[PDB]
Amino acid sequence: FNFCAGPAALPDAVLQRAQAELLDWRGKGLSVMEMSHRSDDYVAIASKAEQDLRDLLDIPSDYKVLFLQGGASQQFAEIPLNLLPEDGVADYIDTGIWSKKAIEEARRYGTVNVAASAKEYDYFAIPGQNEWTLTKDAAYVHYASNETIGGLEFDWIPETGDVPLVTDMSSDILSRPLDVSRFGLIYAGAQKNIGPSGLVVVIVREDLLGRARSVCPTMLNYKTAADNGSMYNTPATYSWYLSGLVFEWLKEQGGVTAMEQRNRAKKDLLYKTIDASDFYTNPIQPSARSWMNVPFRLADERLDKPFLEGAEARGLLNLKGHRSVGGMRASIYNALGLDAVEALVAYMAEFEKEH
Amino acid sequence: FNFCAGPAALPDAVLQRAQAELLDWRGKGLSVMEMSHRSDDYVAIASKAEQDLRDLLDIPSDYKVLFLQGGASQQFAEIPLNLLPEDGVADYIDTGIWSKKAIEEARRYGTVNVAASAKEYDYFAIPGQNEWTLTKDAAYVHYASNETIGGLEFDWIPETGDVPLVTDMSSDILSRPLDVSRFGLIYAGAQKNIGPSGLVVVIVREDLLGRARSVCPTMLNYKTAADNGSMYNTPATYSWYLSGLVFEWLKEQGGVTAMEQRNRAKKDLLYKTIDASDFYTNPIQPSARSWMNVPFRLADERLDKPFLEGAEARGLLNLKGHRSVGGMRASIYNALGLDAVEALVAY
Numbered sequence: 001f002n003f004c005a006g007p008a009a010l011p012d013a014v015l016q017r018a019q020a021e022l023l024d025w026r027g028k029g030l031s032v033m034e035m036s037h038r039s040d041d042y043v044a045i046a047s048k049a050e051q052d053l054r055d056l057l058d059i060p061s062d063y064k065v066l067f068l069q070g071g072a073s074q075q076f077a078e079i080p081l082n083l084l085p086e087d088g089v090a091d092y093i094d095t096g097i098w099s100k101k102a103i104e105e106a107r108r109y110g111t112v113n114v115a116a117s118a119k120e121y122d123y124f125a126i127p128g129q130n131e132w133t134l135t136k137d138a139a140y141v142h143y144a145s146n147e148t149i150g151g152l153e154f155d156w157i158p159e160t161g162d163v164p165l166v167t168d169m170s171s172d173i174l175s176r177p178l179d180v181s182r183f184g185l186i187y188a189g190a191q192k193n194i195g196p197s198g199l200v201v202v203i204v205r206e207d208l209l210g211r212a213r214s215v216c217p218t219m220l221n222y223k224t225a226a227d228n229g230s231m232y233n234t235p236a237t238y239s240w241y242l243s244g245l246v247f248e249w250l251k252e253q254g255g256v257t258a259m260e261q262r263n264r265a266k267k268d269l270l271y272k273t274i275d276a277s278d279f280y281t282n283p284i285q286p287s288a289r290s291w292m293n294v295p296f297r298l299a300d301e302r303l304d305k306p307f308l309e310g311a312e313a314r315g316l317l318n319l320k321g322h323r324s325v326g327g328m329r330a331s332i333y334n335a336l337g338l339d340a341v342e343a344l345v346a347y348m349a350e351f352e353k354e355h
Numbered sequence: 356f357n358f359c360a361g362p363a364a365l366p367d368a369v370l371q372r373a374q375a376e377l378l379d380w381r382g383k384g385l386s387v388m389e390m391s392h393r394s395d396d397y398v399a400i401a402s403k404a405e406q407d408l409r410d411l412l413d414i415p416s417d418y419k420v421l422f423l424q425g426g427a428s429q430q431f432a433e434i435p436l437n438l439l440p441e442d443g444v445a446d447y448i449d450t451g452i453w454s455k456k457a458i459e460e461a462r463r464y465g466t467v468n469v470a471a472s473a474k475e476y477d478y479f480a481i482p483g484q485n486e487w488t489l490t491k492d493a494a495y496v497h498y499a500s501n502e503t504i505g506g507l508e509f510d511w512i513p514e515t516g517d518v519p520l521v522t523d524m525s526s527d528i529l530s531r532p533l534d535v536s537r538f539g540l541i542y543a544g545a546q547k548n549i550g551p552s553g554l555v556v557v558i559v560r561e562d563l564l565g566r567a568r569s570v571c572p573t574m575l576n577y578k579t580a581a582d583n584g585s586m587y588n589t590p591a592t593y594s595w596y597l598s599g600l601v602f603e604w605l606k607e608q609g610g611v612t613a614m615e616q617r618n619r620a621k622k623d624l625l626y627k628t629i630d631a632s633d634f635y636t637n638p639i640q641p642s643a644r645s646w647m648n649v650p651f652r653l654a655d656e657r658l659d660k661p662f663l664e665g666a667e668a669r670g671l672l673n674l675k676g677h678r679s680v681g682g683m684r685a686s687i688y689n690a691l692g693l694d695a696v697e698a699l700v701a702y
């Protein structure tokens with residue numbers, strides 16, 4: 001039971017599958033690691049991963065789906081490099097640490113307008129859109145769907161008229177249905193629900209491609225990736241394959257509709273437990289409580305060490321909160337079942353009783 | 356038996372170890388795939404990978420060793436972005452496809468002087484340095500030590516004074532001893548002679564860092580990966596771990612001197628076969644014949660189909676040449692034993 005915020009737990013079945021065929025994929029005598037990315041076998045693996053992702057999220061045909069490298073952090077530069085004209089303005093929304101890192105990298109490429117900030121609510125809530133100061137002809141509006149450390153998540157899709165929406169969904173993509181047509185670009189570092197580290201998925205409106213500024217590297221150009229099936233150069237071949245295994249696994253589990261029902265029940269159970277007493281606390285207003293990342297603290301912080309030691313004594317790993325916040329944090333991505341949250345909540349009850 | 360140009364086959368010992376501990380690395384109930392890069396277990400893996408590499412090539416202490424993403428191609432932009440002042444000049448050496456790709460990308464960031472071209476020699480030979488037109492005040496000199504497609508390789512190191520040497524060693528790194536101190540920057544896509552795709556190794560003089568131009572992305576700034584142990588953000592954790600297994604394996608095999616002895620054998624054996632008859636042809640002059648990639652044409656190109664068939668028949672796979680090349684090519688990287696070249700010369 002691995003509650004780590006990222007890289008995240010992979011489903012057992014996915015790792016078992018990758019393991020069983022690691023030396024000899026489909027009896028061909030080759031690891032997927034040993035495959036040329038231009039071989040028929042690898043092309044079919046890659047094309048199927050792309051298609052399975054379109055199927056999962058019902059991605060419209062006028063979106064490109066890219067499998068890139070460099071982590072979500074590299075997108076903080078790739079987005080304005082591709083989508084922000086040199087004299088333009090980008091709107092950014094600040095809801096915590098990751099949306100602030102995106103902001104900082106964009107300033108190096110042009111003018112950023114920070115159109116809203118959760119600091120007015122001490123990051124316990126997201127400012128409603130009526131408080132936003134959007135720029136009329138902004139090149140795009142950027143926000144982080146889910147702040148992994150802060151446990152703060154959009155339940156809703158911002159209305160921005162004709163300005164393309166751009167969203168970091170690294171930590172909650174594929175956790176529930178998603179109306180992709182609302183967005184100009186969706187991206188996700190894979191190490192939460194998609195899969196293996198390094199890999200990044202970018203889902204982008206075709207009509208937004210082709211305007212990368214001249215200083216954008218070829219390898220950071222969306223149109224170049226799109227035009228070459230994410231194989232302009234050598235891709236992260238094993239990582240791309242693994243994410244394919246995850247997409248297949250997701251489909252067999254009942255897709256994003258099923259993840260929604262499961263993730264809602266998981267999130268409800270843990271929040272119910274925390275809200276029950278004043279021994280555990282989560283200060284995030286219900287309207288923006290993340291389904292994926294659940295920070296909480298104990299009333300008496302002197303009990304942190306015992307809590308974590310006991311948690312590790314049970315099978316409940318990596319509940320330690322990010323050092324910026326302290327306390328605890330249960331990350332409960334797609335790969336974690338209700339049994340995981342059941343076991344956590346059972347220990348939390350046992351612990352409260354003794355203390 | 357895998358004569359593929361990329362990626363290299365991985366040593367069976369490595370893949371078997373990777374398979375055995377994919378779910379439960381050293382009894383911790385955890386996949387390396389699921390380890391945080393900030394965790395102590397993964398920190399030790401990554402440090403040991405770095406250190407083993409440093410040992411393997413005898414990298415001096417004033418070199419940073421970076422584990423990056425995005426393929427060797429991405430270095431075509433990262434190099435000028437970090438090492439080429441906007442008001443400056445870079446010398447590039449053209450010996451074939453990959454060194455020309457590197458040139459074309461560089462031109463987007465400043466002035467590029469192509470100081471030498473194998474064009475005059477139909478890429479059958481490398482122009483000696485006295486034919487070169489180096490720029491005295493150059494930020495660096497870039498060349499590819501091994502042109503993977505063309506079988507064209509340097510056996511000598513350019514002497515460029517106080518101008519930094521920047522070299523693409525994707526296909527030949529770790530195949531022979533290397534005098535790292537001669538270079539400003541070495542980079543290598545891991546897929547070619549190490550095995551893991553995506554990952555890139557960059558080996559760069561400390562004193563070259565810190566001068567990247569304002570438009571350089573944070574994630575493509577060498578100083579950034581250098582000051583953060585290649586972990587400013589999440590690295591390609593699995594590929595890094597894999598490459599570490601390969602480094603461990605290389606030490607067990609006698610390291611890089613032992614690789615040199617083995618590769619010279621494989622190289623010399625295949626080349627002996629081709630120079631024996633008029634049946635096969637390699638046009639590359641002996642002085643620049645690659646040890647790593649060995650292209651050869653058939654006297655009757657209309658008989659190339661039964662060359663391949665009888666090869667797919669036997670164990671010998673992936674011998675067809677690049678779309679642009681036309682013919683055959685064998686890649687005899689480190690993980691390929693003499694028995695493979697033995698097997699090949701027979702059929």
Ligand SMILES: N[C@@H](CCC(=O)O)C(=O)O
Binds near residue numbers: 001011315379385
């Ligand atoms: N084999 C599981 C871990 C099992 C456990 O310790 O709970 C995994 O790595 O996904």
